[PDB]
Amino acid sequence: GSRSGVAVADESLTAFNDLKLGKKYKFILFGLNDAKTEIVVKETSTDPSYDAFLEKLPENDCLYAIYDFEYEKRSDIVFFTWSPDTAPVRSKMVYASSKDALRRALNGVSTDVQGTDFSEVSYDSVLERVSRG
Known about the structure:
Layout: E1 7-8, H1 10-22, E2 27-32, E3 38-45, H2 50-54, E4 63-71, E5 74-82, H3 89-105, E6 111-115, H4 123-132
Parallel strand pairs: 1-3, 5-6
Antiparallel strand pairs: 2-3, 2-4, 4-5
InterPro entries: ADF-H, ADF-H/Gelsolin-like_dom_sf, ADF/Cofilin
Subunit structure: Interacts with actin and AIP1 in a ternary complex.
Protein name: Cofilin
């Protein structure tokens, strides 16, 4: 790692706050920049469909996500690590090494999901996690 390690980009925190407090986005996808020095916003979305979210997860690459998980009204902020088994090993490793920098910067997450396949991130699987407590 570098001396300071990966930073969370200002835009990532701004987007998170806009979702959390403003409902500006339904979800945010975050990733490492190509320099592997900052966690940046890959994409935001206002699509209410959980399938539209799933359909944006790269089948063979990693990301992080925040989802405003709504169910009956309740709204819980869910953090995902997305690290599918078919992603390259060095990518899984750097996403794992960098996760804490983002995750510790985001206040107000209710539930975490360690997504390694599509079953683990299904709506019903996430509902079970958010609901249990």
